[PDB]
Design a binder for this molecule. Structure first.
Ligand SMILES: OC[C@H]1O[C@H](O[C@H]2[C@H](O)[C@@H](O)[C@@H](O[C@H]3[C@H](O)[C@@H](O)[C@@H](O)O[C@@H]3CO)O[C@@H]2CO)[C@H](O)[C@@H](O)[C@@H]1O
Length: 456
């Protein structure tokens, strides 16, 4: 459990938590502060349940796409590093973790998918997605396959869909518009249709996930896979001679992977914020800190400039960064949740044949665009009435109601955050104010008197 005088960190199990634990032991050796790293299941979903409780972590690690919601709900502490420290990380990595003009996390590394081919089976990897059907059958003649990758998570199948024109939300004037969802445009329809055709000619199987796809490549059963740097570790241990190169082109235009920024967010309810800032700045985000984690599971291209020149020499990094520039940086807005869920539903149905491509994408468009609107009213729907609300609207689509749950859980962390604040323990002042300002006249007076009290 969390309490004053120690750090608890959450990171996804596919990353190098053991190496991260090493960095904390140094910290513990230098400060006497016990550092404990955990890797829970679905920490992306478990966090918004337990953040503002005594069961949430001090530091949370995830790609930058989740943090906008976290931030909007006032569940993160404003990161306040000196200019000299900011000038040690790449500026565009700071953009990712910047939401509404405020820094909400420490950017760690850059994550971008890449084509991971087996050199023993593929000296000249294909340049285009349209070459692959011919190569696979040639490998079918060897009882082999050309490609296998996780098909259950939309993270991995997006690069092909967004190649010719598909996108999440339109970007313009330096801003995203959540009403313009580019999941059902011409460029998106072609990518998925091309993907399914690969499966329908049984160049792939729909049940392929990370665990199995990983096994396939690691045992030299498929010539290619698509995965991130964190996966090179297990592959390095396996006896496969592999290469990491650029993703294949499609219709002249490259497959555009959503680029990820691994980021470290400080719980606003953590009683050891400065204690955390000390760790991330002066231990992890150092040439040795990052080296310790990378040795466990490769991070990719780090945001720390001093240690990026070190990794840039690795061709597998050069491959990723190329794909990174070719692809797009994930938005960090609170609506990316609505976008992901809708797509996760669409691909599984268009892959299992349960629906047309035109249908799933049409439905995903609607559900995402609609569910994306729920966030603008998250703070308005008065307290005790969020379930009555969403039940009043009665949308009932599985991916839509998933956002409802999330939002319903955000509102529950803010009430909890308010509870902590009332009892004089750490709390995020935004989560507090959002809760009072929907708690009738009594909330608003309580809200403002604090705003006035706070003016000291
Ligand atoms: O659809 C279910 C799932 O959608 C969301 O997951 C997305 C992540 O938010 C997003 O960061 C990305 O996930 C990848 C990570 O960025 C990266 O760290 C790496 O480890 O691979 C991840 C893919 O497994 O893309 C996924 C969509 O697949 C949402 O976060 C989840 O709550 C939700 O369960």
């Amino acid at each position: 459990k969390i309490e004053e005088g120690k750090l608890v960190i959450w990171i996804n199990g596919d990353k190098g938590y053991n190496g991260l634990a090493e960095v904390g032991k140094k910290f513990e050796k230098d400060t006497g502060i016990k550092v404990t790293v955990e890797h829970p299941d679905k920490l992306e979903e478990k966090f918004p349940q337990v953040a503002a409780t005594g069961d949430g972590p001090d530091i949370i690690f995830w790609a930058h796409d989740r943090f906008g919601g976290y931030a909007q709900s006032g569940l993160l502490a404003e990161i306040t590093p000196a200019a000299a420290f900011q000038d040690k990380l790449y500026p565009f990595t700071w953009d990712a973790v910047r939401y509404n003009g405020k820094l909400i996390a420490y950017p760690i590394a850059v994550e971008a998918l890449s084509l991971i081919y087996n050199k023993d089976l593929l000296p000249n990897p294909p340049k285009t997605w349209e070459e692959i059907p011919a190569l696979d059958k040639e490998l079918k003649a060897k009882g082999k396959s050309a490609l296998m990758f996780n098909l259950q998570e939309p993270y991995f199948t997006w690069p092909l869909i967004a190649a010719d024109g598909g996108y999440a939300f339109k970007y313009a004037a330096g801003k995203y518009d959540i009403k313009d969802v580019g999941v059902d445009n011409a460029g998106a329809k072609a990518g998925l249709t091309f993907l399914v055709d690969l499966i329908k000619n049984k160049h792939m199987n729909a049940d392929t996930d990370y665990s199995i796809a990983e096994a396939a490549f690691n045992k030299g059963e498929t010539a290619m896979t698509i995965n991130g740097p964190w996966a090179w570790s297990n592959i390095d241990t396996s006896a496969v001679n592999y290469g990491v190169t650029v993703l294949p082109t499609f219709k002249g235009q490259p497959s555009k992977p959503f680029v990820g920024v691994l980021s470290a967010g400080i719980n606003a309810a953590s009683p050891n914020k400065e204690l955390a800032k000390e760790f991330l700045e002066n231990y992890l985000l150092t040439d040795e800190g990052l080296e310790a984690v990378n040795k466990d599971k490769p991070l990719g291209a780090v945001a720390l400039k001093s240690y990026e020149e070190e990794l840039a020499k690795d061709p597998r990094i050069a491959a990723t960064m190329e794909n990174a520039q070719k692809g797009e940086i994930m938005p960090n807005i609170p609506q990316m949740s609505a976008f992901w869920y809708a797509v996760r539903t669409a691909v599984i149905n268009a892959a299992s044949g349960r629906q047309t491509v035109d249908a799933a994408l049409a439905a995903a468009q609607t559900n995402a665009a609609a569910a994306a609107q729920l966030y603008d009213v998250m703070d308005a729907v008065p307290a005790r009435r969020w379930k009555e609300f969403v039940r009043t609207l009665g949308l009932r689509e599985a991916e839509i109601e998933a956002v409802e749950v999330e939002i319903g859980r955000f509102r529950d962390q803010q009430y909890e955050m308010l509870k902590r604040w009332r009892q004089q323990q750490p709390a995020g002042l935004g989560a507090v104010y959002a809760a009072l300002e929907r708690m009738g006249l009594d909330g608003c007076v309580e809200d403002l008197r604090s705003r006035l009290q706070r003016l000291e």
